[PDB]
């Protein structure tokens, strides 16, 4: 097995790494890039906790091989913060009570953000379907959905 070279834009910056191909993208992000915000709750695409924004779309990194991140643009939770401060979306999760144990949160936030970057003013139904790939055992999803809705309203609010 020969190593491969993976070129990608990670959390805003162009990164390059020469590594063994026999690892999942989840392992690459967590181990080689130290982004522990990317969680492994199931290893089979079900929990969505390992979600990252991949070329604009939310994907489960546990279902992907490391080399498949080549030529891609990836955003993990670490890349959502604005100058070390909570983005609007993040501030909304803080205030809406969407956070209990917080393990599904990185995934929830990324999925929400991926949606808002494409559609700034989604319907409640669209918000739900968009986040249906993220499982939560604490909240019952109610307040997680509220947080996103609140972010959408405050965003529109910023019409000054």
């Amino acid at each position: 097995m020969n190593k491969i070279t993976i070129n990608l834009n990670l959390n805003g910056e162009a990164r390059s790494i020469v590594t063994e191909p026999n690892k999942r993208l989840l392992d690459l992000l967590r181990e080689d890039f130290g982004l522990t915000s990317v969680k492994e709750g199931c290893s089979e695409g079900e929990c969505g906790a390992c979600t990252v924004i991949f070329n604009g779309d939310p994907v489960t990194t546990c279902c992907m091989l490391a080399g498949q991140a080549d030529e891609s643009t990836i955003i993990t939770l670490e890349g959502v913060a604005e100058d070390g401060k909570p983005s609007l979306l993040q501030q909304c999760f803080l205030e809406a009570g969407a956070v209990q144990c917080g393990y599904c949160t990185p995934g929830m936030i990324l999925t929400a953000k991926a949606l808002l970057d494409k559609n700034p003013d989604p319907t409640d139904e669209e918000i739900t379907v968009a986040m249906s790939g993220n499982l939560c055992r604490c909240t019952g999803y109610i307040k997680i959905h509220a947080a996103v809705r609140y972010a959408v309203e405050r965003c529109a609010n910023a019409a000054a």
Binding site: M1, T60, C63, M64, Q68
Partner: protein, 291 residues
């Protein structure tokens, strides 16, 4: 995980060359990876050579022709459910695609992967079987086409389907719905997201001006190794108008053939019943589309 050589061809030609070179290994293609990566992680699959084909953007397409619809093998379910024509006129595929796993899985998962995995509960599998799709398989030796039904019945380097070790599915083709034709799909499952189908009900029909049923397709996804062909039921419809009472008249037939053909299935006693509730909904769908 297990060590292995990893290739990511930039063109279809290079992929074919790779598939041929390592055909005796044999090679393990990887698209979205939603089946394979897990098979590898859980050690169910131990490849020595992996060929990633995600860079083959050329295989991502939806071409709506006059009478046929051609879908590239790398098309994700997300691209499929979002296609306005698919969403508007090929309801069976729309519903199936929009109900595969979750958005994350739909963003990665390709129709080529679904059909190539040929899972008993495959929703793409069930829809495409209902629509009587045709697949195109290519390699350095040329290209061939075969009805999805024959692709499943055949056995290549693996038993699940006819794929050869050096082949790559490049496209799926289905007939385009005419003025008065319709298709429906219903996913019977335990939860409304990230659910494995218990019954992937698919139905499609054609009628001739007078309103007479000319063609019928009724499939019981997950009620057989491959979608259960309700042949007797289809033949009952061909030759007469389509009405709730004429379609429901086939219900006892679906019951009987599920119990007969699914004899050894663990939940046969339940599915021979629920398959009737499933198709009734399909009947509604089909009827409203034609009206």
């Amino acid at each position: 995980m297990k060590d292995f050589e990893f290739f990511a061809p930039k063109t279809l030609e290079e992929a074919k060359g790779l598939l041929h070179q390592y055909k005796d290994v044999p090679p393990a293609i990887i698209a979205g990876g939603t089946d394979l990566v897990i098979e590898i992680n859980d050690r169910w699959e131990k490849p020595d050579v992996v060929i990633d084909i995600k860079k083959l953007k050329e295989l991502e397409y939806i071409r709506v022709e006059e009478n046929t619809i051609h879908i590239g093998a790398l098309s994700t379910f997300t691209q499929i459910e979002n296609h306005p024509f698919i969403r508007s006129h090929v309801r069976a595929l729309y519903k199936a695609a929009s109900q595969v796993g979750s958005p994350q899985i739909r963003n990665l998962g390709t129709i080529g992967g679904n059909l190539s995995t040929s899972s008993v509960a495959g929703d793409g599998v069930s829809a495409m079987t209902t629509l009587d799709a045709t697949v195109v398989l290519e390699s350095v030796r040329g290209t061939r086409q075969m009805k999805l039904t024959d692709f499943f019945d055949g056995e290549g380097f693996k038993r699940r389907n006819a794929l050869e070790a050096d082949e790559i599915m490049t496209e799926v083709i289905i007939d385009r719905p005419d003025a008065h034709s319709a298709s429906a799909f219903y996913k019977l499952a335990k939860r409304k997201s990230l659910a494995i189908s218990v019954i992937g009900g698919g139905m499609a029909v054609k009628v001739d001006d007078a309103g007479v049923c000319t063609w019928a397709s009724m499939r019981g996804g997950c009620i057989g190794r491959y979608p259960l062909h309700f042949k007797q039921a289809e033949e009952m419809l061909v030759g007469a108008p389509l009405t709730m009472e004429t379609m429901e008249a086939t219900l006892p037939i679906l019951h009987d053939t599920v119990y007969d053909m699914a004899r050894a299935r663990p939940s046969v006693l339940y599915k021979k019943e629920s398959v009737q509730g499933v198709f009734k909904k399909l009947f509604v769908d089909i009827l409203d589309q034609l009206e």
